[PDB]
Amino acid sequence: QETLNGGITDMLTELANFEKNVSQAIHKYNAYRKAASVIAKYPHKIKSGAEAKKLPGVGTKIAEKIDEFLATGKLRKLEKIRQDDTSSSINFLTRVSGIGPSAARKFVDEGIKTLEDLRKNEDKLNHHQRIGLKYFGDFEKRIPREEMLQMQDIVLNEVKKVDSEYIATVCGSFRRGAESSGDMDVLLTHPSFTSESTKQPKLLHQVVEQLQKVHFITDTLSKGETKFMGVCQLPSKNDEKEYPHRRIDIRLIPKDQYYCGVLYFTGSDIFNKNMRAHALEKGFTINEYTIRPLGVTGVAGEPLPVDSEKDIFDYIQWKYREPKDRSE
DNA sequence: CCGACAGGCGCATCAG
DNA sequence: CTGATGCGCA
DNA sequence: GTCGG
Ligand SMILES: Cc1cn([C@H]2C[C@H](O)[C@@H](COP(=O)(O)OP(=O)(O)OP(=O)(O)O)O2)c(=O)[nH]c1=O
Ligand SMILES: [Ca+2]
Ligand SMILES: [Ca+2]
Ligand SMILES: [Ca+2]
Ligand code: NA
Ligand code: NA
């Protein structure tokens, strides 16, 4: 991953992870990621802090840190953070799926600071954590698109075995066209589940159950009526190493709200934050279901009509961006 | 110079 | 039990 | 940490 301002964006990303995991300051995390991201799309080699301060999201303090990074090749503030035992122990435990900043601090206080520690205090972990630990190495591996293509095929073919009326669409980075993905995201619709009625129950469960039967889904992290979060694995063949286990998310979204749903799930996460914050500036709030006007006194009005992804962009006066131009 | 920062699902836990 | 909140997650 | 009203 060698890149134009890679030094700088790496440094800001690290600082965002610190603020999230150690400081627990969600808005500093966001503001660092917004700055990283804006710098990543800037097509000159940045030469000074002052030059970077021109970009939206970059202010006084990131500017000063860029000056230092460029002059000296590193940042003191990060040099200190990396030596701090506590800080890096908390950062590390957060890499386990299901451990966030709070739980990572509470383990480090109790003396649980390493993977060997996690692996001998099984009893201290809830179900999700336990599976996140079981598949720790596997979930930090990326998924080549060619494997995403096989996993897609399995998911869509089994969904079809349950009910030809389902539509399953693979989203996230896959739909943006990335050559590798962190995990699989499937958006599910069925004619029976619309914003005005649920004419059938068990619509998600039945899909989960079928994918368990053919051994594709192997564990469940959480499961509700519209959202499944778990683990899957491709079948392997005689004499080969098994495929690593992979994180999978499935979201059943009412069929009439497909476009807001797939906007949401196509992301990126940062792009969604930007696009939703722009909507607010303009008098609208967008979620995975609707786009709605904002009333003088904070009150969200009625859902606007939407019949394309592009409709949502028009409302807030954005030129349409193709999924592949929503990355970073 | 200060409020607002994206939006919501599922699980865990607490007061009543 | 319900309802409220915080956590970790997409 | 940054920014618009
Ligand atoms: C993490 C996250 C995701 N999302 C949305 C947009 C994401 O593209 C989508 C799925 O989340 P992810 O699977 O975390 O993201 P991704 O598919 O874009 O990236 P990767 O290749 O690393 O797996 O959910 C949010 O809206 N907010 C969030 O905080
Ligand atoms: Ca984690
Ligand atoms: Ca993904
Ligand atoms: Ca995901
Ligand atoms: Na700026
Ligand atoms: Na196996």
Boundary of a domain, candidates A217, A237, A264: A264
Number of domains in chain A: 4
CA distance A167 to A160: 8
Could you tell me the CATH number of the domain that includes residue A18? 1.10.150.110
In angstroms, the first-to-last Cα distance of chain A is 13
On whether both A2 and A94 belong to a single domain, the answer is no
Judgement on whether residues A194 and A271 belong to the same structural domain of the protein: no
Say whether both A293 and A311 belong to one domain: yes
* Domain extent at residue A314: 265-327
Q: How far is the CA of A173 from the C1' of B5 (A)?
A: 25
Residue A228 in tokens = 């499944």
**Residue/partner pairs of A13-22 with CB below 8 Å, 24 or more apart:** A14/A78, A14/A81, A15/A65, A15/A75, A15/A77, A15/A78, A17/A91, A18/A78, A18/A81, A18/A87, A18/A91, A20/A101, A21/A90, A21/A91, A21/A94, A21/A100, A21/A101, A21/A104, A22/A81, A22/A87, A22/A90, A22/A91, A22/A101
If asked whether residues A79 and A112 sit together in one domain, one would say no
Ligand 4 centroid–CA A172 distance in Å is: 7
Q: Which of A46, A68, A84 marks a domain boundary? A: A84
Task: Please say which residue of A141, A159, A184 terminates a domain.
Answer: A141
Judgement on whether residues A259 and A271 belong to the same structural domain of the protein = no
CA distance A128 to A134: 10
Ligand in closest contact with the CA of A17: 2
CB A46 within 8 A of CB A56: no
Q: How far is CA A283 from the centre of its chain?
A: 26
Are A98 and A61 contacting, i.e. CB atoms less than 8 angstroms apart?
no
What technique solved it? X-ray
Closest protein CA for atom 3 of ligand 1: A269
A217-223 and A180-181 beta bridge pairing: unpaired
